[PDB]
Design a protein around this nucleic acid. Structure first.
Ligand SMILES: [Zn+2]
Ligand SMILES: [Zn+2]
Lengths: 391, 45, 147, 115, 171, 20, 56, 135, 262, 49, 56, 66
RNA sequence: CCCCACAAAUCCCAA
């Protein structure tokens, strides 16, 4: 237990197939995945305990984290990706599906909204039906850097009377955020309707995903030919610049920046150049990346992924680090017995050039191992230390 | 209140990475003085 | 767990009649979350899956060989000439309705191994059991029916 | 283990029929039907073929949880027309269609008798 | 491998040739060269951890010996017999350890020891406190050349399955 | 462009046996 | 520390957990074995007499 | 009970895909009116639209807290339906530009359209309306 | 008349045919009924009188519970649970016995044909273990050498596939419709080209090409389904298809009569 | 079992330091496996030939 | 560095300035050297501020 | 151990063919590919097993118990 | 009953 959360009350619906069972939404506050976790239970005995446990430690009145004044709750990976998929202008849906998913919402008004379109067939926007799960009397405006009230890029979000008007649902809008929808509904209506909202959204989005389906694979990572060739030449020109700086240094004329030592300036410059190479290559790989890609959808949709992840998988990794100072000369005058002595070329001193897609080279593999070991040990010590401080 | 504040300040104790000293050692130093400096720098305007 | 640290547990079990099924009628043995791929950033797992598929097709057993010249492109070419989608994506059907799945799914064989932690060994509950002699508190240990 | 068991798959319930009736109070002539010891294999077919009819207004079915082989089905239609009559006519249509399919199949296969 | 700088054939060459390896294969398939028999006539030499500070190593037997897939001096003295041999026992099982993040390889190396399968063959006779034996072990379709020497293929760990990467909406 | 995706032990055994 | 501010307790259990999107927040899935073992006291009232009698 | 609020003929300038495979933004200028400007989102996959084309628009408040939408009623539906693009939605903002030119913003599920022109400063609406487009 | 059917080809084990004038729900329900609840017979309970082999006992029991059995006349008898009897009378059970002796000096195999019927067969073709190969040897059970003995008594009872895979007669099914994606139910992921990056279905040649730019026929409806059914061998395939249709219609009739009763 | 024979161990302390041999070293090349290590309170201490 | 400064027209604008960063700590003197702001000085080591400026 | 029966994924009976599969690779010196193809395993689910099976009873039985 | 081993569990991230 770390903070006020991880301690919540719960109602019980008893289930076969011996194990525990809980909602995906509450995953984050407990900080518990399903990789084989173990979880405790306590049963009150008297009446006073039950009452005060119901009135203080129940989840519905625990939505907003007092420690950071933003809701610690929030929908999560699967439904998040799915709702991003559904909330796109370019989607539609037919009677057969909408009837079922309307019946899926428990408190559905029993009234079907009119189709947004009629010409050959009644259809509905994902926004249209999703508005049903939203309780009435809610309003929200975002206007994030686009949103000309006729948003071409469709960024931002606007809701009127619990009905979507425009925008694409996003973790930045529906996830744990300062101006999040869950925050608004909790503060506005009542700190239990939000629970029903969670249930409805999760249920309907899961149902739609079931019949839609979504996946990924290797072909997601592989990039265009000429683009990765451009990546290669960018790496090459970065190497050329590094070599030029090294040549200038070796002739004893240099900037000799104020304060720090000549070697320090050299290291700073080379590190800067390598990082420039890495992030420029990642930017190029991303801007290449097709918009029908799954992993790109996933990363821009929120829950899982990063610019760094796709960059490392596709184009380049960047030099491994050991407390900032790049890998030092273990042996005399070299970092590895496969190199000539006294070399400062990025490959010689441990710059990972290749990308995961092609696969590393023995040396680069070793350097990656070094970095991983560093991270492992540092965390394995800080855990006990910071636990002592916390206590 | 006090327990709530302690827990709030103790939550980010884990999610941290580890040149000007910072991080967990700096937190320990400032919270645990320990009249040592390790970075005696001061700004002048 | 896989051979790449991608550990996990079973959530529920379906049967064939409603498990998603492919054109050839193959049905998967188990399905994992696609979201587990990028964050952990384990790529070699997917190469293993693809190579295993092509090896099973050809019957010739595959190769890993950490530092060699084998690349994805040859795998894709060989798999394609065997008569499947080059990157391993596959048309997929929904068992409940039989309707086409809107997307496609990467899908092939992969090696797993069973771990040591069966739930039955780790379930444990107690209500008014034995007390400890020295301190009158509940005793320790699941085996000794502790608290 | 003392849980509801595997016999809920098809072994019918004890002391109760294969179905129960309950009228919704939210829409006129709306009736929800609870089915148990089955799943999609019947509900999908029933809902689709019922929706084929145009005299009916709204039909939908869902399964509450994969653990329990039970599912619910909701129907309402235009005034006067009783939903139960609609569904029984739907079952009649189904049985006739499948019977025609069967008979056609045996006719074909006997025709396709090798040599 | 020991590499003679001199070469009548030209530039530089590691001393061993094709005849020796042919004799090795012949010896093996007989079911009389041993590794020792390779040692005596000066073809491979042991190197302690101290010497490397006075030796230059060639990763590949062809990396620079003479004059898209991936990215690829003239004074070598020894060439690595094979790079994939820098691993240990458990990591050898990991297919393509190059193509994934290192901490993930460490996670797998630690975890694999917690897998069932077979541990001997006499177990029907050999009493013990704890024992796990699964029904139908399968040698994984993917594999590296190493674990053949680990007898792993003889005594597999798990069995492969037909996985699918999808979010089938529930669990 | 196979680049040796597969290896066989018994086939190599028999091939070198007939080679001997 | 091992006895006064922290001690063993009773009426507790621990197992492995799994997700479910068909169960809302405030609920939690519990295996019936625990329900057999874990218990809770009630006091007989003119209100719960029938239910408690049936339960016994 | 059902009357047109505004009718006109428009000429489309050009079509924009907007990296969407099925929907495309559209815009047109009025023929009879020299100031009424139009923009709109159209499902091109459902209905072909070409540049330099004449379009006809209709407001059609209703059709001659509404209850559940009736199934298409394969019997008689004698409605204002002698068009093709019949569809429904809601207005959400009004804007007065140039002190004379009123602007109305209509939302369609996720689709949008913006209308201009200043003579019906009162005829146009309220929140919801229909839309009728022929050929 | 309605849902016409056209046969493609057939063999001892598999059948291919076309299905027309059907809705998707009906076809999927057919698939599920063949794959799920076609009644058959399998070994269920085993009596290990004496084991000596290196192989475990319950291991052998599980292996036995998987050999298919002749089940043409399965409808004749009734379920054990629905039978008024106790302990598996002949009207709802069949008894099998196995006798394996480690006599020779080489390893001796045990094949499905070794076990023999014991109880009354009452004149219905039931319980014969299928021998697919030309060599008359069923699937191998276990092996013995010179010192091992197996005395096994098995009881086979009704069962159905959906509760456990033992009673699964189908074990193989296929499903196709719109090979040309003219319904556009799904698109195709593709890095460079949709066409080249995908192969062509063997069912393509039957339906026409998509007419190369015809406007999207929104009101078109799915039909013309492609079926492949292959049975394990416990029972002829046309039999499994007709039995599936019969059990589905029996289910529908049951729900209708329950409605009437209510 | 094989991964338990070729095993090593050194005494350093109970809790542990964070700048001493836990982290891998260049000299370790080709002698000790750079990935086959336990994690937690012993990471970088036990190592494998 | 730059500092957000009240604009003479009544707004804010990021404006450059020059600052001095050191590698040692002392206050009883640097407060006195001419040409230096005697107010906006600041040090990481708060204890010295307490010893000089005061507990507040 | 004994080759599995009734392939996991599909369900087609496997094991009856196993001994046939062995001699196909002994006196016919074919490859496993053509061996299975003639053996008649279109789907690879029925085929993965035959590829990856590891006999152990061969090692077990050649003890001399009693 | 203690002492020692031996394993899980905290497997990030934000845009
Ligand atoms: Zn009986
Ligand atoms: Zn199979």
């Amino acid at each position: 237990s770390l903070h006020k959360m991880s301690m919540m009350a719960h109602r019980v619906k008893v289930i076969p197939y011996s194990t525990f069972r809980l909602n995906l939404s509450v995953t984050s506050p407990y900080n518990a995945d399903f990789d084989g976790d173990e979880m405790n239970l306590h049963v009150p005995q008297s009446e006073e305990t039950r009452a005060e446990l119901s009135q203080l430690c129940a989840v519905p009145l625990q939505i907003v984290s007092p420690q950071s004044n933003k809701p610690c709750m929030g929908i999560v990976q699967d439904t998040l990706c799915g709702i991003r998929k559904l909330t796109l202008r370019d989607t539609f849906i037919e009677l057969d599906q909408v009837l079922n998913m309307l019946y899926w919402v428990p408190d559905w008004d029993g009234v079907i909204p009119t189709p947004a379109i009629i010409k050959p067939k009644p259809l509905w926007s994902g926004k249209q039906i999703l508005s049903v799960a939203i309780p009435n009397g809610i309003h929200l405006q975002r206007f994030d850097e686009g949103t000309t009230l006729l948003s071409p890029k469709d960024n931002g979000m606007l809701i009127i009377d619990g009905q979507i008007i425009f925008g694409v649902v996003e973790k930045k809008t529906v996830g744990s955020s300062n101006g999040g929808l869950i925050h608004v509904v909790t503060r506005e209506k009542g700190p239990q309707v939000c629970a029903k909202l969670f249930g409805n959204i999760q249920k309907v989005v899961n149902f739609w995903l079931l019949h839609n389906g979504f996946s990924t694979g290797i072909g997601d990572t592989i990039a265009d030919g000429p683009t990765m060739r451009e990546i290669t030449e960018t790496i090459a020109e970065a190497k050329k610049k590094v070599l030029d700086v090294t040549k200038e240094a070796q002739a004893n004329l240099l900037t000799a920046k104020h304060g720090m030592t000549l070697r320090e300036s050299f290291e700073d410059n080379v590190v800067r150049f390598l990082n420039e190479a890495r992030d420029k290559a990642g930017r190029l790989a991303e801007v290449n990346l097709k918009d029908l890609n799954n992993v790109k959808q996933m990363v821009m949709a929120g829950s899982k992924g990063s610019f760094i992840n796709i960059a490392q998988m596709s184009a380049c990794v960047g030099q491994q680090s050991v407390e900032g100072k790049r890998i030092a000369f273990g042996f005399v005058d070299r970092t590895l017995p496969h190199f000539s002595k006294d070399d400062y070329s990025p490959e010689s001193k441990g710059f990972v050039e290749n990308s995961y897609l092609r696969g590393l080279t023995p040396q680069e593999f070793f350097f990656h191992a070094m970095g991983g070991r560093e991270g492992l040990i540092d965390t394995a010590v800080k855990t006990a230390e910071t636990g002592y401080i916390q206590r | 209140v006090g327990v709530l504040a302690a827990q709030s300040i103790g939550e980010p104790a884990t999610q941290m990475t580890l040149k000007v000293t910072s991080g967990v050692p700096r937190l320990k130093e400032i919270l645990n003085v320990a009249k040592n400096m390790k970075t005696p720098s001061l700004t002048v305007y | 767990a896989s051979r790449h640290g991608q550990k996990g547990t079973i959530g529920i079990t379906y049967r064939r009649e409603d498990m998603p099924f492919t054109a050839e009628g193959i049905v998967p043995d188990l399905i994992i979350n696609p979201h587990a791929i990028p964050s952990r950033m384990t790529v070699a797992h997917l190469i293993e899956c693809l190579l295993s598929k092509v090896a099973a097709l050809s019957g010739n057993e595959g190769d890993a060989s950490p530092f060699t010249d084998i690349t994805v492109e040859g795998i894709s070419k060989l798999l394609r000439e065997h008569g499947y989608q080059s990157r391993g994506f596959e048309v997929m059907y929904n068992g409940h309705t039989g309707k086409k799945l809107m997307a496609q799914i990467f899908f092939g064989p992969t090696y797993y191994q069973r771990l040591r932690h069966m739930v039955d060994d780790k379930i444990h509950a107690r209500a008014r059991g034995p007390m400890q002699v020295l301190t009158r508190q509940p005793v320790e240990g699941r085996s000794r029916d502790g608290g | 283990m003392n849980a509801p068991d595997r016999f809920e798959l098809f072994l019918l319930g004890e002391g109760e029929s294969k179905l129960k009736i309950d009228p919704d109070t939210k829409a006129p002539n709306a009736v929800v039907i609870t089915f148990e010891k089955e799943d999609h294999t019947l509900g999908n077919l029933i809902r689709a073929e019922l929706l084929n009819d145009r005299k009916v207004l709204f039909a939908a079915y869902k399964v509450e949880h994969p653990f329990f082989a039970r599912f619910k089905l909701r129907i309402q239609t235009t005034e006067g027309y009783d939903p139960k009559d609609a569904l029984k006519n739907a079952c009649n249509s189904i049985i006739n269609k499948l019977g025609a399919l069967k008979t056609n199949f045996e006719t074909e296969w006997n025709l396709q008798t090798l040599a | 491998f020991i590499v003679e700088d001199d070469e009548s054939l030209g530039h530089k060459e590691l001393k061993v040739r094709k005849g020796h390896i042919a004799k090795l294969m012949a010896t093996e398939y007989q079911d009389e060269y041993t590794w020792s028999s390779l040692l005596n006539e000066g073809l491979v030499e042991y190197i302690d951890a101290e010497e490397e500070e006075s030796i230059l190593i060639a990763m590949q037997p062809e990396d620079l010996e003479p004059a898209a897939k991936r990215i690829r001096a003239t004074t070598f003295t020894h060439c690595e017999i094979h790079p994939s041999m820098i691993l240990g026992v458990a990591a050898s099982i990991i297919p393509f350890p190059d193509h994934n993040q290192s901490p993930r390889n460490t996670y797998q190396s630690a975890m694999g020891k917690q897998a069932m399968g077979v541990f001997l063959t006499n177990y029907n006779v050999r009493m013990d406190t704890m024992a796990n034996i699964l029904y139908y072990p399968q040698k994984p379709l993917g594999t590296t050349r190493a674990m053949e020497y680990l007898k792993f293929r003889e005594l597999p760990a798990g069995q492969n399955a037909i996985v699918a990467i999808a979010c089938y909406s529930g669990y | 462009t196979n680049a040796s995706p597969f290896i066989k032990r018994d086939r190599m055994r028999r091939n070198f046996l007939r080679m001997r | 520390r091992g006895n006064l501010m922290g001690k063993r307790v009773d009426f507790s259990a621990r197992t492995v957990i799994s997700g479910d999107p068909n169960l809302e927040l405030d609920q939690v899935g519990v295996p019936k074995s625990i329900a057999k073992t874990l218990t809770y006291p009630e006091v007989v009232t003119p209100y719960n007499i029938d239910r408690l009698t049936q339960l016994v | 009970m059902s009357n047109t609020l505004f009718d006109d003929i428009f000429q489309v300038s050009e079509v924009d895909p907007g990296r969407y495979n099925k929907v495309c933004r559209i815009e047109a200028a009025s023929t009879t009116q020299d100031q009424c400007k139009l923009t709109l989102d159209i499902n091109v996959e459902l209905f072909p639209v070409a540049a330099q084309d004449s379009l006809t628009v209709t407001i059609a408040s209703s059709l001659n807290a509404t209850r559940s939408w009736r199934p298409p009623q394969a019997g008689d539906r004698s409605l204002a339906d002698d068009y093709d693009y019949v569809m429904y939605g809601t207005a959400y903002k009004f804007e007065e530009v140039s002190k004379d030119l009123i602007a109305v913003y209509y939302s369609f599920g996720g689709l949008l359209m913006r209308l201009e022109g200043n003579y019906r400063n009162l005829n146009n609406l309220q929140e919801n309306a229909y839309l009728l487009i022929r050929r | 008349e309605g849902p016409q059917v056209k046969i493609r080809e057939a063999s001892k084990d598999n059948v291919d045919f076309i299905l027309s004038n059907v809705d998707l729900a009906m076809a999927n329900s057919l698939r599920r009924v063949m794959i799920a609840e076609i009644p058959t017979l399998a070994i269920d309970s085993v009596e290990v009188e004496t084991n000596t082999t290196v192989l475990a006992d319950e291991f052998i029991a599980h292996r036995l519970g998987l050999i298919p059995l002749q089940s043409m006349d399965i409808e004749q008898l009734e379920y054990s649970r629905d039978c008024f009897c106790e302990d598996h009378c002949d009207k709802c059970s069949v008894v099998l016995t196995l006798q394996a002796f480690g006599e020779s000096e080489s390893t001796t195999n045990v094949y499905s044909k070794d076990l023999v019927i014991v109880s009354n067969l009452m004149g219905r073709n039931i319980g014969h273990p299928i021998i697919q190969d030309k060599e008359g040897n069923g699937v191998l059970i276990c092996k013995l050498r010179k010192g091992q003995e197996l005395k096994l008594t098995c009881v086979a009872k009704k069962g159905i596939a959906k509760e456990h895979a033992k009673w699964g007669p189908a074990a193989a099914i296929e499903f196709e419709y719109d090979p040309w994606n003219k319904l556009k139910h799904t698109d195709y992921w593709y890095e460079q080209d949709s066409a080249k990056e995908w192969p062509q279905s063997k069912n393509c040649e039957y339906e026409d090409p998509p007419n190369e730019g015809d406007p999207f026929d929104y009101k078109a409806q799915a039909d013309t389904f492609y079926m492949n059914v292959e049975s394990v061998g416990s029972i002829p395939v046309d039999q499994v298809v007709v039995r599936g249709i019969d059990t589905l219609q029996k289910k529908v009739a049951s729900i209708l009569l329950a409605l009437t009763q209510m | 079992t094989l991964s338990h024979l070729r095993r090593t161990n050194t005494p350093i302390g109970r809790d542990g330091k964070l700048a001493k041999p836990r982290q891998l070293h260049n000299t370790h090349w080709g002698l000790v496996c750079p990935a086959e290590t336990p994690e937690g309170q012993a990471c970088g201490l036990v190592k494998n030939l | 560095y730059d500092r957000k400064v009240p604009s003479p027209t009544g707004e804010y604008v990021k404006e450059p300035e020059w600052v001095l960063e050191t590698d040692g700590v002392n206050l009883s003197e640097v407060m006195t050297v001419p040409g230096i702001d005697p107010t906006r000085i600041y040090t990481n080591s708060f204890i010295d501020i307490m010893e000089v400026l005061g507990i507040e | 151990m004994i080759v599995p029966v009734r392939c996991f994924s599909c369900g087609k009976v496997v094991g009856d063919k196993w001994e046939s599969y062995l001699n196909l690779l002994q006196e016919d010196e074919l490859d496993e590919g053509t061996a299975l193809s003639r053996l008649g395993l279109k789907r690879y689910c029925c085929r993965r097993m035959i590829l990856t099976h590891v006999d152990l009873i061969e090692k077990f039985l050649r003890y001399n118990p009693l």
